[PDB]
Nucleic acid binder design. Structure first.
Ligand SMILES: OC[C@H]1O[C@@](CO)(O[C@H]2O[C@H](CO)[C@@H](O)[C@H](O)[C@H]2O)[C@@H](O)[C@@H]1O
Ligand SMILES: [Mg+2]
Length: 580
DNA sequence: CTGACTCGCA
DNA sequence: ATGCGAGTCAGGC
């Protein structure tokens, strides 16, 4: 049966109570400079729907929106906050965000709309957004009658669900995680997204020019070596040319056919000259289509800025994700790709890019959580952890560690953090499973505390049904009891990795909140631009670099206190590339 | 429109 | 071995 509400033609005082469920609807997935199609408010006085032209033009309403003492409960308040920023309107006083609450209670649910969150509490008097708006090509805002009832039902749901969600969060000891970490961070991400990052489009276009020429050369060279033309981008056509036409050996298969992944090609390289060209082609083509053309597609023509959207409620570990564009995977490892960063510049004249990154935060977190004496001492001495690991597992002095030994000790450390497995390590190191197992065994002999932790955390995941992070984020692992070896092992690796990756996420998130409070107290113009898992990227006047050099690392290093120190490196320059 | 396969990042 | 997003090709509606 329909839900009662007032389809208001003008704003009234009772619509401005100091407590309400608020819905500021933005249907476009990318909410930057997007339309607000309707507004719903549910409070002690009733349910109301307001047309955006009316509400957002009303001084009383706008003032109410910006009054921190007028508390609002919402779902994805960041979306509304940013769409409002583009309209020059400030949203304050959001005390409860149902999206973030749902995400903390169970990130596996994949809650993406009010209906999904409401179902967690057997509340179903609200439709999924997709049912109301449609899929993609068929997506669209419905007529006012249907739209208004949908927004009211969502507001009503939020109004009703706040208490039960807060109660369960309290029981989980996650109440502060929502109120003191995720919600305040939400506002910071909103500012970051709205500010955006300036892009030197001319530079990108220059690079695209050079790429197009080089790509054309390697392309012809490839057909020349294949004795014909084909679509190199087709793992299907390619596999036929390599494994059938040229008779190259098949060392690995995908699931649908031949495997042409870079790791396998590298092994075929010594057989035919075409392999190196295909790898080079893969490289250039990746940069051209994803980082040159792809980036250019989302730069705002007017401001020449890209405005990413940080999905704060998606990952199973507590990390953020970045989209349109993804600014968390801009090339850096290989020089050619690294040059892409020269295109990310400060938004104002005489400003510089400042980047600060935690040094080995995951292994430092592991040292803290496992309380491994050897690992803790290593970081207390600020030793090169990979060289040290090599010394221990290979039983040699620092002078006897060869480049290859460190490389393998490094790979072992990656495995330990990801959830060790002989098969996985063997694959990565291109060695036998028995050999990989021997490495792992030697590792545990040198770091018995880590061995104890891995055994204990898996036992705990089984007993409790989930694992937690330093700040009480949690992840349920039902597969941990599966009788299927593969499924169970995947869950065991997650039990081992999540607390490490997740705790690192908690720490940097708190560093971001602490940093912003510090920047405000100091009245610095510096502001965050991006976060890339273990690093923070800022931009500021050149006159503020010396202050930032001391302030940023300190705040990041002091975000939390562990049994081992946290170490932060930093650099700054004219472009993101130069902030090295 | 959607699942594969690929590769960029931490 | 953790796990994110985007571009490509492919088959399919
Ligand atoms: O606004 C981001 C927020 O919205 C969700 C759905 O509630 O994701 C939507 O928006 C993202 C950014 O535009 C898209 O990537 C996603 O496809 C779309 O459903 C949440 O996942 C997210 O926290
Ligand atoms: Mg680092």
């Amino acid at each position: 049966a329909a839900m009662a509400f007032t389809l208001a033609d003008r704003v009234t005082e009772e619509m401005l109570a100091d407590k309400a469920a608020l819905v500021v609807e933005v249907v476009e997935e990318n909410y930057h400079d997007a339309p607000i199609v309707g507004i719903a408010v549910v409070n002690e006085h009733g349910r109301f729907f307001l047309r955006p032209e009316t509400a957002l033009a009303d001084p009383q309403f706008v003032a109410w929106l910006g009054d921190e003492t007028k508390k609002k409960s919402m779902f994805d308040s960041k979306r509304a906050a940013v769409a409002l920023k583009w309209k020059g309107i400030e949203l304050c006083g959001v005390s409860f965000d149902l999206l973030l609450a749902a995400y903390l209670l169970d990130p596996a649910q994949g809650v993406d709309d009010v209906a999904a969150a409401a179902k967690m509490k057997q509340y179903e008097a609200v439709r999924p957004d997709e049912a109301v708006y449609g899929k993609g090509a068929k997506r669209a805002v419905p007529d006012e009658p249907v739209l208004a009832e949908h927004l009211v039902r969502k507001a009503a749901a939020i109004w009703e669900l706040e208490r039960p969600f807060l109660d369960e969060l309290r029981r989980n000891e996650q109440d502060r995680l929502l109120v003191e970490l995720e919600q305040p961070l939400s506002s910071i991400l909103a500012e970051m997204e709205f500010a955006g990052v300036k892009v030197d489009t001319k530079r990108l276009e220059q690079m695209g020019k050079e790429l197009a020429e080089q790509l054309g050369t390697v392309e012809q060279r490839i057909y020349e070596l294949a004795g014909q033309e084909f679509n190199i981008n087709s793992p299907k056509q390619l596999g036929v040319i390599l494994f059938e036409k040229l008779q190259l050996p098949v060392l690995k298969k995908t699931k649908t056919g031949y495997s042409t992944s870079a790791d396998v090609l590298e092994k075929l390289a010594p057989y035919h000259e075409i392999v190196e060209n295909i790898l080079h082609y893969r490289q250039l083509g990746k940069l051209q289509s994803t980082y040159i053309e792809g980036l250019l597609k989302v730069v705002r023509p007017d401001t020449k800025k890209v405005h990413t959207i940080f999905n704060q409620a998606l990952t199973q570990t507590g990390r953020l994700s970045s989209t349109e564009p993804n600014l968390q995977n801009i090339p850096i490892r290989l020089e050619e790709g690294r040059k892409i960063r020269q295109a990310f510049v400060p938004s104002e004249s005489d400003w510089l890019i400042f980047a600060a990154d935690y040094s080995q935060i995951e292994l430092r977190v592991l040292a803290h959580i496992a309380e491994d004496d050897n690992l803790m001492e290593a970081f207390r001495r600020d030793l090169d952890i990979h060289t040290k690991t090599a010394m221990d597992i290979f039983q040699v002095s620092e002078d006897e560690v060869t480049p290859n030994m460190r490389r393998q000790a490094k790979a072992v450390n990656f495995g330990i953090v990801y959830g060790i497995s002989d098969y996985g390590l063997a694959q990565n190191l291109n060695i036998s499973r028995k050999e990989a197992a021997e490495f792992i065994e030697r590792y545990f002999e040198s770091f018995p505390g880590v061995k104890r932790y891995m055994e204990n955390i898996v036992q705990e995941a089984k007993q409790k049904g989930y694992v937690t992070t330093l700040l009480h984020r949690r992840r349920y692992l039902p597969d941990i009891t599966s009788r299927n070896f593969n499924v169970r092992s995947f869950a065991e690796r997650m039990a081992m990795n999540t607390p490490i990756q997740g705790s690192a996420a908690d720490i940097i998130k708190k560093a971001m909140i602490d940093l912003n409070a510090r920047l405000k107290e100091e009245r610095l113009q510096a502001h965050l631009l991006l976060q890339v898992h273990d690093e923070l990227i800022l931009e500021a006047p050149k006159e503020e670099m010396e202050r930032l050099c001391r302030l940023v690392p300190e705040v990041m290093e002091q975000a939390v206190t562990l049994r081992v120190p946290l170490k932060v490196d930093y650099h700054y320059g004219s472009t993101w590339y130069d902030a090295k």
